[PDB]
Amino acid sequence: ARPCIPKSFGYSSVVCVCNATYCDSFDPPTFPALGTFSRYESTRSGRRMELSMGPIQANHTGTGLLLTLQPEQKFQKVKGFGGAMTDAAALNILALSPPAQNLLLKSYFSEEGIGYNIIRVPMASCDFSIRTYTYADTPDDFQLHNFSLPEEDTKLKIPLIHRALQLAQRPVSLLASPWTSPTWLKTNGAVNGKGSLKGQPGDIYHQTWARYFVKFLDAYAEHKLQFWAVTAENEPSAGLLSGYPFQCLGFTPEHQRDFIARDLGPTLANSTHHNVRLLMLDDQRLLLPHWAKVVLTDPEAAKYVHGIAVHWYLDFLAPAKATLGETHRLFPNTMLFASEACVGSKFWEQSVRLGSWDRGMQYSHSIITNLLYHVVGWTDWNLALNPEGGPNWVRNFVDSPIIVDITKDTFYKQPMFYHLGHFSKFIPEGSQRVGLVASQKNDLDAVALMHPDGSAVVVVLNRSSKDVPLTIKDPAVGFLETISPGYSIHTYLWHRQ
Amino acid sequence: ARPCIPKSFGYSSVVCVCNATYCDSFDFPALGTFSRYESTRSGRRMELSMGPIQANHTGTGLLLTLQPEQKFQKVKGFGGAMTDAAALNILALSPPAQNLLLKSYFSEEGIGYNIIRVPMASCDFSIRTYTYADTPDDFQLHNFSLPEEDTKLKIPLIHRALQLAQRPVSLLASPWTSPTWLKTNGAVNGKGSLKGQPGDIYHQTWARYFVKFLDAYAEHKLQFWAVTAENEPSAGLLSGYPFQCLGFTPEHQRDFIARDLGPTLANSTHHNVRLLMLDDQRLLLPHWAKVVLTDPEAAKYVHGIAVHWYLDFLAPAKATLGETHRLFPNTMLFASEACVGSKFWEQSVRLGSWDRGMQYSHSIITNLLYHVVGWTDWNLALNPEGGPNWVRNFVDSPIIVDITKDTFYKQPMFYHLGHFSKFIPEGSQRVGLVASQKNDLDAVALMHPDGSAVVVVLNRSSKDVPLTIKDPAVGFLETISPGYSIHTYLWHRQ
Ligand SMILES: *[C@@H]1O[C@H](CO)[C@@H](O[C@@H]2O[C@H](CO)[C@@H](O)[C@H](O)[C@H]2NC(C)=O)[C@H](O)[C@H]1NC(C)=O
Ligand SMILES: COc1ccc(-c2cnc3c(cc(C4CCN(C(C)=O)CC4)n3C)n2)cc1
Ligand SMILES: *[C@@H]1O[C@H](CO)[C@@H](O)[C@H](O)[C@H]1NC(C)=O
Ligand SMILES: [Cl-]
């Protein structure tokens, strides 16, 4: 319906400029006839999820790259895609005028946008908070008599989550994760640095901490918000490092295993929130398969664990096959879910690089690899940040798919937004990854899925400078003859019989 | 010979204060007696005590049994890097303070280092950018020369280190970047590799640069044990990599070694210098070794695999070192650089950190238990900010120099390193050591070239662990490993 208003900030590609009266959007889906396909294309040169259509041919003659669909080779079912409602993201969004806020929320959550169906919600403060706090800061309040949600929840996160669900196309799943417990429950008495819960699983400290999760879920339920899942701790391995600068709570895999079995698992199961899923790990995949083996070989722990949450930061050091692949081989019934990702955190990195095609490609390469290795969903970090990549109470400034410019009542949709949308918009919950084989070695990243209705979706990413002529074969429909231009991402859709 | 002058900076343990006139220093018992060197978080610094080895042991307590006929790798040694930053910090002290610092590391009154890693020109731990051949398009390397960093700082200091050492010291050289006129991006840093392809003028000139370097240091009466093919070759593959780098995929390194580096070094008067591959994060193994070592032309020139160790990464060594040794048992593994943190993010100095000490010793034990022949620390000395560094990529070091007080601080990392370096001479062999029951201790047993035993025991837990060490030739060693302690046991076997 409305095209991208491009703006170059001097980096490799453009951003799309939005404000109080204008934002780029899509028209409702059309249903292209059997024997034809739809293509959505984004390019470094500036195209942003542009729609084209073409024929599917009965025949193909050539020696070129062929990608063959194998619809009978079934893999994982998709849960979804989304991002995090941090204090920083909520503050930024709400500092825009109300019409600009609605266009930003529609961009992410509506069918006119990219159809997010996951919101990650931190349990109290984390680095993208402007201050440190927990829900139970009165010291030694073991009964949690003074447990309460501050304005960060009641005035910022909760109102925005309600507005996102009201605008959403699809049912939205909320995921909760804690960074720190109250300081009086920790060995170091501080929100950050090396420290774990005091004592041992089954004791007063571990029982209070598990009850805090029920109190959190109760408080959100009083605000008409229900969670799909909770993680056992955000980055539990971070709390084992001396000088760790952000809110954390250290758990070795044995400690996580025992806390789940003795405290979190039974406390959750014996509450009105027993249907809420529990995800373990919520950390780097380099900790796999070892962390899954420690937790999931204990049946008292394994019985409470629905899935394994992974963060992307060490993916370049942890081959997918040895980590995700081996974890799936060992525990095929325990889903793998990517729960956090952001660019810009390395020591020399510019926090925000308005229009970076490289940062968009990093997102789509990650999503594809994860989908090729049994992962059921992918979650971005901050839904929005300012042009400095904040605010943040610890000067850790990073990038985000949407950058809010408060002084201009304007927001910018980065290449990451569109790279993520090439998946989120076209792969609804319940879609299933299917086989897709290449005829020869190639430089493309591709994945194929089938929608619940039987229609096909193929995402093709080209991270090379060269155009790659390509054919996609559906054994029941035919050959989709195409070209994957250098530095492009395409999403192909087509009806099947 | 002189005890630790402790000082706290608000961290878990103390540093040892040294100055122009004072520094803590050191001084084998008869068969039937053992020596114990203990360091504790509470303040003990490689304290010597002795005790009996008894013929009999009755009990159900933890038993570590020495397996002398189970022989593993032989040790090359231990040391650290003489970066520009290390040399500037050391030379900032008055000459008597510099000598106590150098004796701390290299003398027998110190911790007996026998390895010095020498960067070939600038890196991040430099105060400026430079190479040895910055005059453009000098393919014959006629304008190749060593600057002040080598001739006034590094070379005189290495000479002073070798004078103080009783053990032969091995030098190891590594380049960060080539001259920029040999690079695809024409820059010291960023994503860029050598121009063209192996066998050509660019690759030939770069191979010749290694020989010119070895020739230059040979004129300064310095010979090298080994060179690495490139410091962290994966770095120059990253867009916007912030400091000195030269990118190589494993395929490119394989072909440059096979076509240029290997033949050039073999045809030169430095043909005896060993060539080490990878010189990057151990997490890149086994993939990197599989690519290079499966090519016979590359395999004939590669002596070993140099690995880096960033201590914040929690990963199983069996997957990297273990699998690499299983695939290439005749290719030695050597740790060429280790330091705190996670490479790509930021850190600060923690004066007196016992946690960082424990990271070092836990890492050395892991390496030795997984066939690694040596362990090289990064910068030998840093200032209190963990510099100087031209891109602010600060990190901790075992020795911190405070110019304003003409003082230097010896960190727990120094002593954790010393529990190995001082007691494990070159030629020592790792031997089997078996635990009777599952435990919280990190332990390694080695045999000195003379047959004597050395056992290092690290206790990372808060609890005191009683234990017995069984040697079938001498008897039993009855001891206690206190919480947050590191011990080195020594005893004659005959
Ligand atoms: C919000 O963004 C829109 C889109 O860029 C702006 O609309 C343009 O405004 C100029 C000046 O009035 C017109 O000449 C263009 O034709 C408009 N473009 C479109 C596509 O309508 C709008 O002005 C911006 N609003 C603010 C307050 O900056
Ligand atoms: C003081 O300012 C700052 C302090 C710290 C920061 C800052 C920001 N992002 C960071 C880090 C460390 C990591 C890594 C380390 C390696 N990993 C492990 C071992 O699991 C994964 C996580 N990330 C992603 N530090 C930024 C700014
Ligand atoms: C050097 O250290 C020793 C031991 O602590 C002390 O006695 C002496 O006064 C110090 N010298 C200076 C110049 O500070
Ligand atoms: Cl590493």
Give the integer Cα–Cα distance in Å for A145 and A251.
Answer: 26
Cβ contacts of B344 on chain A, cutoff 8 Å = 346-347
In 3D space, the residue among A415, A385, A361 whose CA is nearest the CA of residue A6 turns out to be A415
A403 pairs with which residues across the strands? Answer: A385, A412
Distance from C-alpha of A81 to C-alpha of A434, rounded to nearest angstrom: 18
Q: Report the residue among A21, A25, A96, A97 best suited for mutation to probe ligand 1: largest number of ligand atoms under 8 A from its CB.
A: A21
A21 lines ligand 1 (CB under 6 A): yes
Question: Can you tell me the distance from the alpha carbon of B207 to that of B230, in angstroms, rounded to the nearest whole number?
Answer: 11
- The answer to whether A209 touches A251, Cβ cutoff 8 Å, is no
Q: How far is CA A44 from CA A50, A355, A416, A463, in A?
A: 13, 9, 12, 10
CB A180 within 8 A of CB A190: no
Say how many C-beta atoms besides its own lie within 10 A of residue B370's C-beta: 21
Rounded Cα gap, residues B307 and A310, in angstroms: 27
Alpha helices, DSSP H, located in A153-225: 158-167, 204-221
C-beta of residue A236 within 8 angstroms of C-beta of residue A279: no
- β-pair partners for B175: B120
* B356 CB within 8 Å of a chain A CB: yes
To the nearest whole Å, the CA of A469 is away from the closest chain B CA by 26
Measured CA to CA, the distance from residue A436 to residue A70 in angstroms comes to 6
User: Alpha carbon of B248 to those of A317, B266, B277, B322: distances in Å?
Assistant: 16, 22, 11, 24
A348 touches chain B (CB under 8 A): yes
Q: Is A319 on the interface with B (CB under 8 A)?
A: yes
The chain B residue lying nearest A237, using CA atoms, is B314
Say what the resolution is, in angstroms.
1.9
- The residue whose two tokens read 């000459």 is B95
Helices A357-372 & A415-424 angle (0-180, nearest 10)? 30
Report the residue among A310, A312, A345 best suited for mutation to probe ligand 2: largest number of ligand atoms under 8 A from its CB.
A345
Distance of CA A115 from the midpoint of ligand 1 (Å): 26
Q: Which of A152, A235, A326, A429 is catalytic?
A: A235
CB contact under 8 A, B314 and A347: no
CA distance A314 to chain B (A): 9
Instruction: Evaluate: CB of A345 within 6 angstroms of ligand 2.
Output: yes
For residue B438, count CB atoms less than 10 angstroms from its CB and return exposed for 0-12, middle for 13-18, buried for 19 or more: exposed
Which sign, positive or negative, has the C-alpha torsion A246, A249, A254, A260? negative
Q: Which of A134, A405, A352 is nearest to A248 (CA)?
A: A134
Determine the atom of ligand 1 nearest the C-alpha atom of A5.
5
Let me know: does A280 contact A309? Beta carbons within 8 Å: yes
Peptide bond into B96 cis (omega under 30): no
Across the A:B interface, residue pairs with CB atoms under 8 Å apart total: 43
B36 beta partners: B49, B489
Q: Where are the domains of chain A?
A: 5-30+78-431, 35-77+432-497
A64: number of Cβ within 10 Å? 13
CA–CA gap between residue A19 and residue B246 (Å, rounded): 44
The pair phi, psi for residue B152, each rounded to 5°, is -110, -30
**Are B282 and B316 in contact, with CB atoms under 8 Å apart?**
no
Is residue A33 a contact partner of residue A495, using CB atoms and an 8 Å limit?
A: yes
What pairs with residue B477 in β-bridges?
B53, B469
Supply φ then ψ for residue B61, to 5 degrees.
Answer: -65, 165
Q: Which residues contact B191 (CB under 8 A, 6 or more apart)?
A: B185, B236, B237, B238, B239, B240, B241, B247
Tell me if B346 CB under 6 Å of ligand 2.
Answer: yes
Helix (H) or strand (E) holding B364: helix B354-369
For chain B, breaks with the C atom over 2.5 A from the next N come after 27
Minimum distance, in Å, between the CA of residue A259 and any CA atom of chain B = 19
Give the span between the Cα atoms of B369 and A116, in whole angstroms.
Answer: 48
Chain B residue numbers touching A351 (CB-CB < 8 A): none
Specify burial of residue B167 (Cβ count, 10 A radius: 0-12, 13-18, 19+).
Answer: middle
For residue B408, give the nearest of B133, B169, B194, B92 by alpha carbon. B92
Is the Cα dihedral A42, A43, A44, A48 positive or negative?
negative
Task: Tell if the CB–CB gap between B350 and A318 is shorter than 8 Å.
Answer: no
Distance of CA B23 to the CA centre of its chain: 23
From B21, B25, B101, B405, mutation site for ligand 3 pocket: most ligand atoms within 8 A of C-beta: B21
B221 residue type, one letter: K
CA dihedral for A114, A118, A119, A120, sign (positive or negative): negative
- Cβ–ligand 3 contact at B402 (below 6 Å): no
Buried b (16+ CB within 10 A) or exposed e, B330-349: ebbbbbbbbbbbbbbebbeb
